[PDB]
């Protein structure tokens, strides 16, 4: 059987790895297991020295998981022996499966322009990429478009984790004007968030309403207490599209770059 290898960066939040794994086991599983897929963790700007994808020791196919600007560099001179799909950033190159980050961070903007909130603030864990950017412009920029301020002061670093959630939401607190819509761009943050929400009897949605980013399993934001509103990146379906392309880039049906686009869709809980 031939073999994928999906490349799993280690600057990724680790937990979005199950996502993958259920979105490839699950595309599999309805093609009789035609492929053989094997995860490769490696260590941040160092996909160029992998073996897999060298022209000795090459799997049959590869996905980028999270490329960095420095793999990506090594990718774009680089004339290889394999099909390599890169999961959300576009490329003239390569075949790519990406989701319209803008248009997510637009998403949930519209969402509290609809409600006519007047302010907003936002908890950011730092862009690992330009679509992680891209996100966030696409909400920033959209609320001001919309008549939602969003104070520079407002805007609050964070680490990606609920416990990185918990610190901001504390942070959050101690602002003497606190606005009344949050966007977090990970869901691993609002869940630590609304940890603290909860504490401090703060009411979700009545004295703050959030919309955070999906990027772990849905099901934490569908049953959190209160169900988080999310914009999710569609992971399971990308990566199942990812071993279509790769099939059809292998039989030579289609040729590079093939770029696929998902839509985030918004999930509104409550």
């Not at 993958?20 to 093609?31: C, H, M, P, T, V």
């Not at 772990?216 to 207490?225: A, G, I, K, L, V």
Request: glycine share 4%.
């Amino acid at each position: 059987k031939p073999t994928i290898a999906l490349y799993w960066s280690s600057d990724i939040s680790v937990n979005i790895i199950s996502r993958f794994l259920r979105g490839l086991q699950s595309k599999l599983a309805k093609q009789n297991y035609n492929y053989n897929v094997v995860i490769c963790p490696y260590k941040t700007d160092c996909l160029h020295l992998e073996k897999g994808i060298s022209k000795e020791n090459s799997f049959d196919a590869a996905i980028i998981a999270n490329i960095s600007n420095y793999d990506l560099e090594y990718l774009n001179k680089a004339s290889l022996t394999l099909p390599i799909i890169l999961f959300n950033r576009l490329s003239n190159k390569y075949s790519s499966v990406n989701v319209d980050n803008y248009k997510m961070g637009e998403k949930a903007s519209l969402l509290f322009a609809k409600k006519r909130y007047k302010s907003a603030a936002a908890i950011l864990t730092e862009s690992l990429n330009d679509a992680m950017d891209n996100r966030n412009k696409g909400f920033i920029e959209t609320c001001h478009k919309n008549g939602i301020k969003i104070s520079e002061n407002h805007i609050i670093a964070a680490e990606n984790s609920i416990h990185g959630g918990v610190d901001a939401a504390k942070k959050l607190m101690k602002l003497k004007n606190t606005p009344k819509a949050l966007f977090c761009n990970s869901d691993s943050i609002a869940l630590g968030v609304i940890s603290v929400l909860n504490k401090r009897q703060i009411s979700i949605p009545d004295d703050i309403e959030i919309v955070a980013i999906g990027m772990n399993d849905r099901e934490y934001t569908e049953f959190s207490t209160p169900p988080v509103t999310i914009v999710d990146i569609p992971i399971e379906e990308m990566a199942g599209t990812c071993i279509s392309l790769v099939e059809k880039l292998i039989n030579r049906d289609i040729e590079n770059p093939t770029s696929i686009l998902f839509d985030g869709p918004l999930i509104l809980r409550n």
